[PDB]
Design a protein around this nucleic acid. Structure first.
Ligand SMILES: Nc1nc2c(ncn2[C@H]2C[C@H](O)[C@@H](COP(=O)(O)OP(=O)(O)OP(=O)(O)O)O2)c(=O)[nH]1
Ligand SMILES: [Mn+2]
Ligand SMILES: [Mn+2]
Ligand SMILES: [Mn+2]
Length: 430
DNA sequence: ATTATGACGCT
DNA sequence: AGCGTCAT
């Protein structure tokens, strides 16, 4: 009752750029705009691997992790842009630099947590309080929410998309308690006004469109963001959670799309998020551990406490390349040459990071995969990173891995390596 | 031959 | 520290 918490203390948004790498290439090359198009890495094997897909191309069934040749079977007029290749490997610098453009704009409105190259959480609680105090009580016009959906509305007692969106928004606004500066629904609504402004600024100043979710925590904001893509934002209120979760497959919630989610389904004999409410907190902890159990108990009621961390820069700067099938590395000269290539890209990126961001990495993590190993990484070892020098970094990586060569011959490398990965970590201010 | 990342939890 | 999971 009056003491049972409802997880409505914050306003959190998740902003995700639509088909980002595609939008970056479409900005650069206007011939690709408003077309079925995709971004690919490499080209020789099956046309290259697709990693991003415009919504026009998605309508034909084109997806990520599809070979370009197969995509062309679904969509013969598909247009393709290729990721840059430098030092023999894919180089993602163009997309990282575009990401910094967007993140710097977002940071003008609130402190952000960079969750990926293309998405960031926003803690809007304080900005909402500000705008409400500037809002001397007058209601929020629908004109301030021109791209907002209210999940679950319209309901109760026109056959167009935009008409439905507007009906739901009008039902929502009509029911608003605009006189109460502590009303969570009002706070979410003002958060959505701010996110409209942030998304408008991103598009005006970069050309890029995005989607967003507004709710009371990170998981609901992420889920909300996915409900109406592209170029739209969705408000998920606390009150919308019972209906939303009653038909929500457990795997759709962030962190439950893998083995843990499958075990929730198999152990409890349930399918949907809402079914979790019938278990006690102790029951869930008994199956899934104390941390997971408390998290699930709260999450299935719409409640989650993970903070938006004030972190707009990545914590690690890494370089990796797979050597699949017959391209696996089988000589010492080969291994050394590719370690050097990776280390030279790493040096370039680290030196730019030090100039931009006033910090230096201090640990080098070296990871490899050996042929026939099912795991992504067969081995991970760390060593000291004391100098931003590619030859030193590659020599050190070779020293940390050289005992994995089981070949008696010092010239050959066996079993051959199917992955190399260098990662700079443990930053200190400088 | 589903690639190049990046974050975080466990012990 | 080194490994596993999750995201995509
Ligand atoms: N190199 C590489 N990049 C990836 C991979 N998966 C995704 N990316 C990149 C390309 C995408 O444009 C970008 C953002 O990922 P998202 O899941 O947010 O999808 P995207 O923005 O493409 O589409 P959407 O958000 O659904 O509109 O990340 C991958 O496996 N390898
Ligand atoms: Mn995206
Ligand atoms: Mn994303
Ligand atoms: Mn995607």
């Amino acid at each position: 009752g009056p003491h049972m918490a409802t997880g409505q203390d914050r306003v959190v948004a998740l902003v995700d750029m639509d088909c980002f790498f595609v939008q970056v290439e479409q900005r650069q090359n206007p011939h690709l705009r408003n077309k079925p198009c995709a971004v690919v890495q490499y080209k020789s094997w099956k046309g290259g691997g697709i990693i991003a897909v415009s919504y026009e191309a998605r309508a034909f069934g084109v997806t990520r992790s599809m070979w370009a040749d197969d995509a062309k079977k679904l969509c013969p007029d598909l247009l393709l842009a290729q990721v840059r290749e430098s030092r023999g490997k894919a180089n993602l610098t163009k997309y990282r630099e575009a990401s910094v453009e967007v993140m710097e704009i977002m940071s003008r409105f609130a402190v952000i947590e960079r969750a990926s190259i293309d998405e960031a959480y926003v803690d809007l609680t304080s900005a909402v309080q500000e705008r409400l105090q500037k809002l001397q009580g007058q209601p929020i016009s629908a004109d301030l929410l021109p791209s907002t959906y209210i999940e679950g509305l319209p309901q109760g007692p026109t056959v167009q998309k935009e008409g439905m969106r507007k009906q739901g928004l009008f039902q929502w606004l009509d029911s608003l308690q605009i006189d109460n500066l502590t009303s969570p629904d009002l706070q979410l609504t003002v958060g959505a006004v701010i996110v409209e402004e942030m998304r408008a600024a991103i598009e005006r100043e970069t050309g890029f469109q995005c989607s967003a979710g507004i709710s009371h925590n990170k998981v609901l904001a992420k889920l909300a963001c996915g409900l109406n893509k592209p170029n739209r934002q969705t408000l998920v209120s606390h009150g919308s959670v019972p209906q939303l979760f009653s038909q929500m497959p457990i795997r759709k919630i962030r962190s439950l799309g893998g083995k843990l989610g499958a075990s929730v389904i198999e152990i409890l004999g349930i399918e949907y998020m809402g079914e979790l409410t019938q278990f006690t907190e102790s029951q869930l902890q008994s199956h899934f551990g104390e941390k997971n159990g408390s998290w699930l108990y709260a999450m299935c009621r719409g409640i989650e406490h993970d903070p938006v961390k004030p972190r707009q820069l990545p914590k690690t700067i890494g370089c990796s390349k797979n050597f699949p099938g017959k391209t696996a590395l089988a000589t010492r000269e080969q291994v050394q040459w590719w370690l050097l290539q990776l280390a030279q890209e790493l040096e370039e990126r680290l030196t730019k990071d030090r100039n931009d961001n006033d910090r230096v990495a201090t640990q080098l993590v070296v990871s490899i995969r050996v042929q026939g190993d099912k795991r992504l990484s067969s081995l991970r070892r760390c060593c000291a990173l004391t100098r931003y020098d590619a030859h030193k970094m590659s020599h050190d990586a070779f020293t940390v891995i050289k005992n994995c060569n089981t070949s008696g011959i010092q010239t050959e490398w066996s079993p051959p390596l199917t992955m190399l990965f260098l990662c700079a970590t443990k930053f200190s201010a400088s």
